[PDB]
Amino acid sequence: YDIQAWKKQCEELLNLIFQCEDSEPFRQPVDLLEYPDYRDIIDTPMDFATVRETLEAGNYESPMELCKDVRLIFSNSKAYTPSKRSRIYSMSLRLSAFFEEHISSVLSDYKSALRFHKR
Numbered sequence: 001y002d003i004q005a006w007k008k009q010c011e012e013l014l015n016l017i018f019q020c021e022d023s024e025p026f027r028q029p030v031d032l033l034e035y036p037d038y039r040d041i042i043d044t045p046m047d048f049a050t051v052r053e054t055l056e057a058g059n060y061e062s063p064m065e066l067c068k069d070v071r072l073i074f075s076n077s078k079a080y081t082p083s084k085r086s087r088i089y090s091m092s093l094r095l096s097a098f099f100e101e102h103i104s105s106v107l108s109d110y111k112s113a114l115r116f117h118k119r
């Protein structure tokens with residue numbers, strides 16, 4: 001029932017994501033010199049360094065907010081992909097599966113702790 005435990009759990013999960021080779025295209029903001037029309041398709045760019053910085057700055061109130069930003073990394077990749085003949089979207093799908101598998105208990109424990117706090 002520790003209401004703050006999610007933060008270190010998210011830091012550790014981000015460390016695992018950064019070691020994973022599948023995170024390579026998503027570790028830093030998309031380079032507009034490489035993808036000049038990126039902002040014509042994507043309204044809100046997101047990447048794992050921005051998520052980590054937001055977490056470390058104390059600018060996430062809950063793991064649900066962090067989840068929403070990580071999911072935006074994957075939705076942006078899906079929206080920008082021209083087709084399955086894209087290694088980057090395929091990497092996003094595997095990385096998304098890995099993230100969802102690990103974030104499930106973080107969200108459940110946090111929501112349970114908050115329900116206990118407000119009992």
Ligand SMILES: C[C@H](O)c1cnn(C2CCCC2)c1
Binds near residue numbers: 026081082087
């Ligand atoms: C074409 C490819 O599927 C794709 C999707 N999004 N992107 C961005 C995010 C990662 C670096 C560039 C490339």
